[PDB]
A paper describes a structure:
The first structure, determined at 1.33 Å resolution, has SAM bound to the enzyme ([name]-MTaseSAM). We expressed and purified ZIKV [name]-MTase (residues 1–266) of the H/PF/2013 strain as a soluble protein from E. coli. Purified protein was crystallized at 20°C, and the structure was determined by molecular replacement. Initial maps revealed difference density in the SAM binding pocket despite no intentional addition of the ligand in the purification or crystallization buffers. The structure of [name]-MTaseSAM was refined to a resolution of 1.33 Å, with Rwork and Rfree values of 17.0% and 18.9%, respectively. SAM binds in a cleft formed by β1, β2, and αA as well as a loop (amino acids 81–86) that carries the consensus “motif 1” (GxGxGx; x, usually a small chain amino acid) characteristic of Rossmann fold methylases. The SAM adenine base is sandwiched between the Lys105 (partially disordered) and Ile147 side chains, whereas the N1 and N6 atoms makes hydrogen bond with the backbone amide of Val132 and side chain of Asp131. The ribose sugar participates in solvent mediated interactions with the backbone of Gly106 and Glu111 and side chain of Thr104. The methionine portion of SAM is fixed by interactions with the side chains of Ser56 and Asp146 as well as the backbone amides of Gly86 and Trp87. Asp146 is part of the K61-D146-K182-E218 tetrad motif that has been shown to be important for both N7 and 2′O methylation.
Author numbering: 3 to 266
């Protein structure tokens, strides 16, 4: 083999940054949705204003509007948290049912109950560890699990744990999927992702709403990405942002998910 990858170099540089450098680096040049209004409304109990429950709805919007993902049918959302991906999925015409599962509890996000469009086809279940749930068939499989660590070895071990669990769900044959890959950047991870692409298809995409402090990419059924090239391009973007001036954030309006129930 050839030793340290570009993403491993990125992680080592990230760990050596001072806190002041990290503070400016983490958002340099990223895209960000404005959330102050949504958070205030949600704090006020507004359920019909179209507000997204988290920044996650915008991440899924980015993938869907570009054709990386075409959700349909029964959607299962593993690690749904407050529900940003589940509520976004429920607004999509071809989606018919959304079931989110999340752990909840101290230090973890609980599902939030709002009345964005299609809320009546969404069921969010807390108190569920998806690593100990039997996999079920679905049409679209979503998973946004993976806890960051300063150790790249820990990030790799955590990502392999996520992907092994997701493989049990992929074996039930959904036609669409979107899976967070916390660590795509070690040699073991790139080999694993190539194997997974051969069996299940799809490819990796970097969402520009991700912060520069994580190398996360999304494995989606509609990408046709060379694993090594897509990971390397992302490592180069993240490394390049470690040099030179702070780049401005590209602010965007957050997703508005509307209101009202869906008919059947
Ligand atoms: C990145 S957040 C997901 C955000 C979500 N996609 C959204 O748009 O709001 C990942 C969620 O997975 C949950 N989680 C982590 N491990 C879990 C597990 N083993 N079982 C179920 N949920 C888990 C975390 O508590 C967290 O709320
Ligand atoms: Cl997580």
């Amino acid at each position: 083999g050839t030793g340290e990858t570009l993403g491993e170099k990125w992680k080592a540089r990230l760990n050596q940054m001072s806190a002041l450098e990290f503070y400016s680096y983490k958002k340099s040049g990223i895209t960000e949705v404005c959330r102050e209004e949504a958070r205030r409304a949600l704090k006020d109990g507004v359920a019909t204003g179209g507000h997204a429950v988290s920044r996650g709805s915008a991440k899924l919007r980015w993938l869907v509007e570009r054709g990386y993902l075409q959700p349909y049918g029964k959607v299962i959302d593993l690690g749904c948290g407050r529900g940003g991906w589940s509520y976004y999925a429920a607004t999509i015409r071809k989606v018919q049912e959304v079931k989110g599962y999340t752990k909840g509890g101290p230090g973890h996000e609980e599902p939030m109950l709002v009345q964005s469009y299609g809320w009546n086809i969404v069921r969010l279940k807390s108190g569920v560890d998806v690593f100990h749930m039997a996999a079920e068939p679905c049409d679209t499989l979503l998973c946004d699990i993976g806890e960051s660590s300063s150790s790249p070895e820990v990030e790799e071990a955590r990502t392999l744990r996520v992907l092994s669990m997701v493989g049990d769900w992929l074996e039930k044959r959904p036609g669409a999927f979107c899976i967070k890959v916390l660590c795509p950047y070690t040699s073991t991870m790139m080999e694993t992702l190539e194997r997974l692409q051969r069996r299940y298809g799809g490819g990796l995409v970097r969402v520009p709403l991700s912060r520069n402090s994580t190398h996360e990419m999304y494995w989606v059924s509609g990408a046709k990405s060379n694993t090594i090239k897509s990971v390397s391009t992302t490592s180069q973007l993240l490394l390049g942002r470690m040099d030179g001036p702070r780049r401005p954030v590209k602010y965007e309006e957050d997703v508005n998910l509307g209101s009202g129930t869906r008919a059947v």
